[PDB]
Amino acid sequence: LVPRGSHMAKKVRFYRNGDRYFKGIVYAVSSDRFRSFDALLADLTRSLSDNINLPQGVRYIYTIDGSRKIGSMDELEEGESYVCSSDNFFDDVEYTKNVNPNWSVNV
Numbered sequence: 001l002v003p004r005g006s007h008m009a010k011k012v013r014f015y016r017n018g019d020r021y022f023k024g025i026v027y028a029v030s031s032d033r034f035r036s037f038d039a040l041l042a043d044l045t046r047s048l049s050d051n052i053n054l055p056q057g058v059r060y061i062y063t064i065d066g067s068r069k070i071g072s073m074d075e076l077e078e079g080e081s082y083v084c085s086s087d088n089f090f091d092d093v094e095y096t097k098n099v100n101p102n103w104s105v106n107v
Contacts, residue, residue: 005031005073013081013102015064016048018091024099029076037073048084056086066090079104 001007009028016022025047027040034040045057061070062083070076079102083095 002032007032009033010073010076010078011102012076012078013099014044014048014061015081015083015095016053017062017083017085017089018093019053020093020095020097022095024081024095029073031073034073037071040073044084054084054086058084058086060085060088062090064095066092 007030009030009032011026012029013024013026015024025044027043029040034043041058041061044061045054048054049057062068062085063070064081064083066083070082076082081096083090
């Protein structure tokens with residue numbers, strides 16, 4: 001087992017800034033799966049970038065409403081959605097429209 005973290009994978013959904021027709025990619029995030037926050041950013045750059053999206057790669061992770069930036073894997077919350085950005089501009093588009101909402105825990 002890796003000697004860092006909790007070992008419990010966090011299921012999170014990643015969107016790419018300004019793209020209204022992007023599904024989001026569901027990641028199982030843990031220290032066993034990603035060496036560091038940087039390895040997660042590198043992985044996200046490869047999965048989310050294209051010739052029209054994230055030209056400088058994934059360098060910022062915002063909360064779904066763009067209120068706050070995430071700076072560690074610890075800051076990510078299970079069942080939450082995040083927006084990946086190449087810069088400091090959060091694009092207010094309908095990311096969450098026409099997506100399956102995650103299972104909300106009742107008990």
